[PDB]
Design a protein around this ligand. Structure first.
Ligand SMILES: [Cl-]
Ligand SMILES: [Cl-]
Ligand SMILES: [Cl-]
Ligand SMILES: [Cl-]
Ligand SMILES: [Cl-]
Ligand SMILES: [Cl-]
Ligand SMILES: [Cl-]
Ligand SMILES: [Cl-]
Ligand SMILES: [Cl-]
Ligand SMILES: [Cl-]
Ligand SMILES: [Cl-]
Ligand SMILES: [Mg+2]
Ligand SMILES: [Mg+2]
Ligand SMILES: [Mg+2]
Lengths: 76, 75, 76, 74
């Protein structure tokens, strides 16, 4: 009702389209990330690892190489 | 008048919102690619049974979750 | 310049929230790129005789994971 | 002025919270994904690691093309 509130609502409406795109996409990405973890779970239950070696214990050379490539990509 | 102020506010935010929007957009695209690759991989290498985390969480998944939780707490 | 001082104040109020979102989006984008590189190396070393995508046929494992996560999102 | 600035932020807070929470869980899950790749590849090592700049797997190319069509139509 107040003129200040009307301005605040107008500011939000100017941002709404952009925020909607970000928010909706973040929802789809979050859902897909959860599906990815469920697929990892089913895959590893069916194909178990004798030991689970995480990066703080030892980083696979494949992971190191992939990280270095993407780092160079981002640096360009 | 009022609209010119509102447009000025949005333009001040645009570059930051663009960076966020572009990064989230490519992440969403890559997440969709990731699922298609899972599909092709599992079609070629099927699982006799599909065990989801509500039935049983793999010890490997639990260890990875615990490690990442410690990383996020200390990073 | 009176409007610009207010516009700058509004941005500074949001900066901390926007920085957190932007920095995480950057780390997530980098990790998603690494994930694709690891798929590439994994599939080059372990090629698929045929590549069946979900529009041709959706693996029952993918269908089950999608349904589980969809129920998770609906209940939460 | 400051009361107006806070009103603007509070109007956006709920939308920004949803975005922040979703992005945070996605970032966490992406980290878990990389740790699982590490454990999987330590247990099942690759004789050579071929990245996309050397050669892109036909499976990756096909998946990329399908997803591009999906994003264009959805
Ligand atoms: Cl190491
Ligand atoms: Cl290694
Ligand atoms: Cl782009
Ligand atoms: Cl989980
Ligand atoms: Cl669960
Ligand atoms: Cl369990
Ligand atoms: Cl287990
Ligand atoms: Cl199907
Ligand atoms: Cl199937
Ligand atoms: Cl190529
Ligand atoms: Cl190939
Ligand atoms: Mg096996
Ligand atoms: Mg993955
Ligand atoms: Mg093996």
């Amino acid at each position: 009702l107040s003129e200040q509130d009307a301005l605040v609502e107008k500011i939000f409406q100017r941002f709404k389209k952009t925020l909607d795109v970000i928010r909706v996409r973040a929802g789809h990405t979050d859902k897909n990330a959860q599906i990815n973890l469920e697929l990892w779970n089913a895959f590893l239950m069916a194909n178990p690892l004798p030991v689970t070696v995480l990066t703080d214990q030892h980083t696979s050379e494949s992971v190191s190489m992939a990280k270095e490539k993407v780092s160079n990509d981002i640096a360009t």
